[PDB]
Short mmCIF file of C-alpha atoms and ligand atoms in Angstrom, two decimals:
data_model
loop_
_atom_site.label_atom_id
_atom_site.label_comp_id
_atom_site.label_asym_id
_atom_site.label_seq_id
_atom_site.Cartn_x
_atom_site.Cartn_y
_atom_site.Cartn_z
CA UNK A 813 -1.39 -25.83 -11.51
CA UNK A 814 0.77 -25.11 -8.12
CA UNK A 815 3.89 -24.30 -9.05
CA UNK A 816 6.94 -25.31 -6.13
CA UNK A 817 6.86 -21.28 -4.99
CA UNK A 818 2.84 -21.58 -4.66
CA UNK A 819 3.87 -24.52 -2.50
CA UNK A 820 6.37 -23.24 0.01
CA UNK A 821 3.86 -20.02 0.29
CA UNK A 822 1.19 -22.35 1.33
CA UNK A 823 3.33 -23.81 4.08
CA UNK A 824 4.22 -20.30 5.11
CA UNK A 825 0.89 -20.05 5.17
CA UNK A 826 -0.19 -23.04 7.23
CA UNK A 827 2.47 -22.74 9.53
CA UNK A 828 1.58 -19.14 10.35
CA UNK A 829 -1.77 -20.09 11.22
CA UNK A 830 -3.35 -16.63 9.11
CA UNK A 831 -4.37 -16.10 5.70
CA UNK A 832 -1.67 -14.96 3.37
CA UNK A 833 -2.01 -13.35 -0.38
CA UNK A 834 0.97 -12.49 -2.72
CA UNK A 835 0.76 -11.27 -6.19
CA UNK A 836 4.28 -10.81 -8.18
CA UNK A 837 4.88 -8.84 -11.62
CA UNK A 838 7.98 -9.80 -12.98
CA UNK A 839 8.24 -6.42 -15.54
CA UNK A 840 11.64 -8.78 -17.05
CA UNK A 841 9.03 -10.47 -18.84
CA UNK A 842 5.27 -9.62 -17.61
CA UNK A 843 4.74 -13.04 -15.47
CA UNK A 844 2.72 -13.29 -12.55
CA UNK A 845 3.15 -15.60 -9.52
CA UNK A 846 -0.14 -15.26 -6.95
CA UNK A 847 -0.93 -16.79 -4.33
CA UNK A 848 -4.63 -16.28 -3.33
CA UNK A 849 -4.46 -13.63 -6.09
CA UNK A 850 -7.84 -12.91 -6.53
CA UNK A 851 -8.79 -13.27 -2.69
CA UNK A 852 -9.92 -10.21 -0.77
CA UNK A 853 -7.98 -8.78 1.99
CA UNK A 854 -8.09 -5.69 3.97
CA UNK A 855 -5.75 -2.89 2.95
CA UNK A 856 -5.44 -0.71 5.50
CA UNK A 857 -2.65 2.06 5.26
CA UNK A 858 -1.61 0.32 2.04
CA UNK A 859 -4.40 2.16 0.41
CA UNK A 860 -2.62 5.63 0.90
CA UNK A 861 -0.78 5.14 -1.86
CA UNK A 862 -3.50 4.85 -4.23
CA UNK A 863 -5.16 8.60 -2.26
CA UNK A 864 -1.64 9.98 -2.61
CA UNK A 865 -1.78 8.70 -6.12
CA UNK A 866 -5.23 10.51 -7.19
CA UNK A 867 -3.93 14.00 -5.64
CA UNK A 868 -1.00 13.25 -7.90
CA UNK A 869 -3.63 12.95 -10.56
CA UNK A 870 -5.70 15.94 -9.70
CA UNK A 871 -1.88 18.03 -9.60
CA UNK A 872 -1.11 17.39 -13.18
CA UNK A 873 -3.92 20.20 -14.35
CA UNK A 874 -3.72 22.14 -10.79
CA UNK A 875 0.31 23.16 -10.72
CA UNK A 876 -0.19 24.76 -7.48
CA UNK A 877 -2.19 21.73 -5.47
CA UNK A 878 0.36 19.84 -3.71
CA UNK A 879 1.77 23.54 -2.22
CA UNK A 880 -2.17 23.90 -1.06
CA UNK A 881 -2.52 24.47 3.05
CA UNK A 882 -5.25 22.67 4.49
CA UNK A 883 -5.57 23.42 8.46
CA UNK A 884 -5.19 20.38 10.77
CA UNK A 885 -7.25 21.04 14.09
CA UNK A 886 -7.63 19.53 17.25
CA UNK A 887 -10.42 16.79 16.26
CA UNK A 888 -8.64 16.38 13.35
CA UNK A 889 -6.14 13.98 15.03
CA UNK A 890 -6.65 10.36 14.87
CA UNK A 891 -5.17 7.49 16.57
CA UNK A 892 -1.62 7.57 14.59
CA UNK A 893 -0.66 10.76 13.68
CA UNK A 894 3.30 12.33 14.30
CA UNK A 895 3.38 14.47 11.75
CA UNK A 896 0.19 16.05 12.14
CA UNK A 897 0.39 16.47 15.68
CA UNK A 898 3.12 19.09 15.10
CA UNK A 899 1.09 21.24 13.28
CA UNK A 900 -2.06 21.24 14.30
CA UNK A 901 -3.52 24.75 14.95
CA UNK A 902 -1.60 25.29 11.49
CA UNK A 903 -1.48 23.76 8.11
CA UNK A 904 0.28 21.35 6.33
CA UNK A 905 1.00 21.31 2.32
CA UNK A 906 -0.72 18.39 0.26
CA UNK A 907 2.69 17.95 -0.64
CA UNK A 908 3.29 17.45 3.12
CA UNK A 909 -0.10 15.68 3.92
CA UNK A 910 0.99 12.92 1.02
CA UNK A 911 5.06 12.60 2.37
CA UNK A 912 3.45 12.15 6.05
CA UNK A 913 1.27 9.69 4.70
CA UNK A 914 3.14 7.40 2.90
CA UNK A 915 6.33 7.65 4.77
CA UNK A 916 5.52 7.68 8.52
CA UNK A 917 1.80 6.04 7.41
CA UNK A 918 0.12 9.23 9.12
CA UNK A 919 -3.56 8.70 9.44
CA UNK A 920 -4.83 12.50 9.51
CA UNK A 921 -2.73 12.93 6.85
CA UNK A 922 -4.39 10.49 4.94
CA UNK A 923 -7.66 11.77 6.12
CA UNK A 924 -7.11 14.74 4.18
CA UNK A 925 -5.92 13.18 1.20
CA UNK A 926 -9.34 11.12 1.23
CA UNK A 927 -11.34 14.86 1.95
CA UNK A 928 -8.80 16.71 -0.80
CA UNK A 929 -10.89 13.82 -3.35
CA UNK A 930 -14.14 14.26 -1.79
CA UNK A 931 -14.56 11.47 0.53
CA UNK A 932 -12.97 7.45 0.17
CA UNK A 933 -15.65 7.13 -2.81
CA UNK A 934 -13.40 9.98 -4.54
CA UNK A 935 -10.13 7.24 -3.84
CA UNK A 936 -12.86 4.23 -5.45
CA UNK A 937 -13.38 6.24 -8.62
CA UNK A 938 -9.77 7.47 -8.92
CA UNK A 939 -8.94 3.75 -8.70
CA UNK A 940 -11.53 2.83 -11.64
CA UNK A 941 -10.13 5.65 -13.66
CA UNK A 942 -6.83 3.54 -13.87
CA UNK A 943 -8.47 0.25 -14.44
CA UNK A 944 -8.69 -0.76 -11.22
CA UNK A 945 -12.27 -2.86 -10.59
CA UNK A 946 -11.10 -4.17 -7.56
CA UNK A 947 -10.10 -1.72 -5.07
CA UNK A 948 -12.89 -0.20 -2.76
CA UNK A 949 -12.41 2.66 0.05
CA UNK A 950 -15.16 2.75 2.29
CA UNK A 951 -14.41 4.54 5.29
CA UNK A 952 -11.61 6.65 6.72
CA UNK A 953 -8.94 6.22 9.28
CA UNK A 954 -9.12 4.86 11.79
CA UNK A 955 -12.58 2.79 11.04
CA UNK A 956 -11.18 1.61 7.46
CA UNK A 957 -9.01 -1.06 9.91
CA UNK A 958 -10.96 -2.79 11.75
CA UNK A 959 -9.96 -5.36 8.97
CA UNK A 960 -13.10 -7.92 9.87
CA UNK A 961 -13.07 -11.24 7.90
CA UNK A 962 -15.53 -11.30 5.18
CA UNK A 963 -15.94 -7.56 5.20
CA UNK A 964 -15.93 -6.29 1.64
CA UNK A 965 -15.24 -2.87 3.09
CA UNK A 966 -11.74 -1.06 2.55
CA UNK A 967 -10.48 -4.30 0.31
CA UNK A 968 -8.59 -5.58 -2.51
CA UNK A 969 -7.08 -8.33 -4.13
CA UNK A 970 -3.23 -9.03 -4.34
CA UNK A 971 -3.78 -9.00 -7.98
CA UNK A 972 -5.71 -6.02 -8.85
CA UNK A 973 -3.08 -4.15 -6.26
CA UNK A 974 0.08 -5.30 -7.93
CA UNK A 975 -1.32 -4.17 -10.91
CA UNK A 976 -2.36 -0.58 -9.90
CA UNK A 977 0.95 -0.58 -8.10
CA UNK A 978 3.38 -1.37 -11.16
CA UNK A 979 0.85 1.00 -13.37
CA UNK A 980 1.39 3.83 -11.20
CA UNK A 981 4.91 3.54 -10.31
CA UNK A 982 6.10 2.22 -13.64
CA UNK A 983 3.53 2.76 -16.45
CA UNK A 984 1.40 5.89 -17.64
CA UNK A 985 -1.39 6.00 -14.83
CA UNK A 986 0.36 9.42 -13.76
CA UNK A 987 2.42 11.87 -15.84
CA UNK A 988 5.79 11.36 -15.63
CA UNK A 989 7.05 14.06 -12.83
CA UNK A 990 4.27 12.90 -10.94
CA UNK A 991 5.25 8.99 -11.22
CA UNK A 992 8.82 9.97 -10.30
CA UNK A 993 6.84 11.87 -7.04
CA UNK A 994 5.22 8.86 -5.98
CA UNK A 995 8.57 6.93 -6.53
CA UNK A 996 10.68 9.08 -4.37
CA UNK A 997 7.67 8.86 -1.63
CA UNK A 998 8.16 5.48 -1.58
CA UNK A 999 11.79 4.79 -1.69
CA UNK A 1000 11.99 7.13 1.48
CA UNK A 1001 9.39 5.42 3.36
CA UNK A 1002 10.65 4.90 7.21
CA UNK A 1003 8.63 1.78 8.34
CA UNK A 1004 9.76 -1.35 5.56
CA UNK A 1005 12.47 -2.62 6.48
CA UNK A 1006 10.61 -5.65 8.99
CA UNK A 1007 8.81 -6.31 6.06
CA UNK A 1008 8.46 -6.92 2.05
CA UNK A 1009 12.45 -5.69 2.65
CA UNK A 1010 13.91 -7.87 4.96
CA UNK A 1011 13.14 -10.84 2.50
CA UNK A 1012 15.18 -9.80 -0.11
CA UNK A 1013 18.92 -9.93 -1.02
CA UNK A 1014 20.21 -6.45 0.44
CA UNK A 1015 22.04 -5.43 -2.40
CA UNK A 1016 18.56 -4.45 -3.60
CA UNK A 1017 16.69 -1.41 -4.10
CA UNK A 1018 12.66 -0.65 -2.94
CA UNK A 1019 10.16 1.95 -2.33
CA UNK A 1020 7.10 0.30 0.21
CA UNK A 1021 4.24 0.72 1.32
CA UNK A 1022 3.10 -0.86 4.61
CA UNK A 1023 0.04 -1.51 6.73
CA UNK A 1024 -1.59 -2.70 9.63
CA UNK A 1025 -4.69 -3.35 11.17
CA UNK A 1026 -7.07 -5.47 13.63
CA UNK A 1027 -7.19 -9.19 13.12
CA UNK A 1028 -3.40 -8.70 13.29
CA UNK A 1029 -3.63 -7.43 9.34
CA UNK A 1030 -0.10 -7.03 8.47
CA UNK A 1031 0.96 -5.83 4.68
CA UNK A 1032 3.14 -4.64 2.06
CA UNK A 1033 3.19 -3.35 -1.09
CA UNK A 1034 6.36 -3.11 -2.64
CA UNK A 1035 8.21 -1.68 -6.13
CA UNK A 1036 11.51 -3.50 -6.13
CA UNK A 1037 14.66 -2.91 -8.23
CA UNK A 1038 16.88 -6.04 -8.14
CA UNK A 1039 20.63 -6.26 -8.68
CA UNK A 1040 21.02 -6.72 -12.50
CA UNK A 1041 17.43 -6.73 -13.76
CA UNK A 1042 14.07 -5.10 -14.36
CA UNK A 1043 12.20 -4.19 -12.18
CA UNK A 1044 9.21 -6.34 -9.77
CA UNK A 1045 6.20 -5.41 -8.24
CA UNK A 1046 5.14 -7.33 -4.99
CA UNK A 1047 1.90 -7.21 -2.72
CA UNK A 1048 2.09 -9.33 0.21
CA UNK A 1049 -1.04 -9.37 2.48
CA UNK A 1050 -1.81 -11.84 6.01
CA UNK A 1051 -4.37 -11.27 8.29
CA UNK A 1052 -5.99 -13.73 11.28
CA UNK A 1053 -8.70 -15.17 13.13
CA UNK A 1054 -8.77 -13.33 16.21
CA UNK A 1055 -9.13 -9.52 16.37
CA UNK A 1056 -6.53 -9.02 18.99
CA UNK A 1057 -3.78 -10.82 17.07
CA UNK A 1058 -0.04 -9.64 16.74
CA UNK A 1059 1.59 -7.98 13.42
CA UNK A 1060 3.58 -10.57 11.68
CA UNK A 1061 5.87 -8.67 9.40
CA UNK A 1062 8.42 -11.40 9.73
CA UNK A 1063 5.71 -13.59 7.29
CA UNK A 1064 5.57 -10.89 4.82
CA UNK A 1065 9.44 -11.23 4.75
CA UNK A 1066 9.39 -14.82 4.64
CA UNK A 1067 6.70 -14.72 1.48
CA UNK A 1068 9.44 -12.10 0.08
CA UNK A 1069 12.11 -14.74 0.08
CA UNK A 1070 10.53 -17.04 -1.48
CA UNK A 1071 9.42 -15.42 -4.61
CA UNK A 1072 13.02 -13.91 -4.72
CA UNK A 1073 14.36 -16.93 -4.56
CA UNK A 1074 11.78 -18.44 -7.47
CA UNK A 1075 13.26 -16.55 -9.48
K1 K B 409 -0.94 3.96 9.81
#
């Protein structure tokens, strides 16, 4: 079927001129709403959550990890990096390296998260660990954006993300300290509010995570506490034809509204 909500996303979609995918968990009662749900789209800094996640992981037998220094150098720096910039020629925390990554979507940071697991194959097999089949990491920043259509490479679905997302930030894929880590990451993240945010009624509450890439790849990933009920999870991915294109976070904001007000 296509329900009236998969019909107002599709003129979203059409009028935007892009390719749009939205997956909603409703945890009130388990239902899904998608919209290209089981299309492939490139993640780009949307995948830091699930690197941040698997250091997570790797800290529940290692106590010590996240207050591990790993140096940032000189060729270390990539094409976005403000956090890292200020200490290279030092160290940084993997406490640090995941905040900077998820919060100001720092790029060496997240290189280092990727190294910390052994490479973005170490991020793939964290993923399967948690049931995951979807998700693939490929490269690392900056060549995991060059977001080209049809590349498999540094992909999911909306989907299989929602799910990883509302399995690490409200099920058992982490231990419980580390779950409420990754949650306070989240809800302090600096660069939502164009996005997955501005969609929604402002009385409510959200940790995101955003991205961007080439082919004007703009997304969100979003764990969502309205007024009054449980909990939603939301992945909201658009991408275009030409490689040059603009960000359009205003669409992700516009898919937003429309599932909030479907429900
Ligand atoms: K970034």
């Amino acid at each position: 079927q296509t329900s009236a909500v998969q019909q107002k996303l599709a003129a979203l979609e059409k009028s935007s001129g892009g390719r749009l995918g939205v997956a909603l968990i409703d945890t009130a009662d388990n239902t899904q709403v998608l919209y290209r749900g089981d299309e492939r789209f490139p993640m780009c800094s949307t995948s830091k959550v699930m690197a941040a996640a698997a250091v997570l992981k790797q800290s529940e037998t290692q106590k010590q990890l996240l207050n591990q220094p790993v140096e940032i150098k000189p060729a270390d720096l990539v094409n976005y990096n403000p956090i890292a910039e200020k200490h290279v020629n030092g160290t940084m925390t993997l406490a640090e390296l995941s905040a900077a990554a998820l919060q100001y979507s720092d790029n060496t940071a997240m290189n280092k998260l990727i190294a910390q697991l052994g490479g973005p194959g170490g991020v793939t097999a964290f993923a399967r660990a948690i049931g995951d089949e979807t998700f693939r990491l490929d490269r690392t920043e900056p060549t995991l954006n060059t977001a080209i259509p049809g590349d498999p490479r540094d992909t999911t679905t909306p989907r299989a993300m929602a799910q990883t997302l509302r399995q690490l930030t409200l099920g058992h894929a982490l231990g419980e300290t580390q779950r409420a880590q990754l949650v306070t990451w989240l809800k302090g993240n600096t660069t939502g509010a164009a996005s997955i945010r501005a969609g929604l009624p402002t009385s409510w509450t959200a940790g995101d995570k955003t991205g961007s890439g080439d082919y004007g790849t703009t997304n969100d990933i979003a764990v969502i506490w309205p007024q009054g009920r449980a909990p939603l999870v939301l992945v909201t991915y658009f991408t275009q034809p030409q490689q040059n294109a603009e960000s359009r976070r205003d669409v992700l904001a516009s898919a937003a509204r429309i599932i909030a007000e479907g429900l």
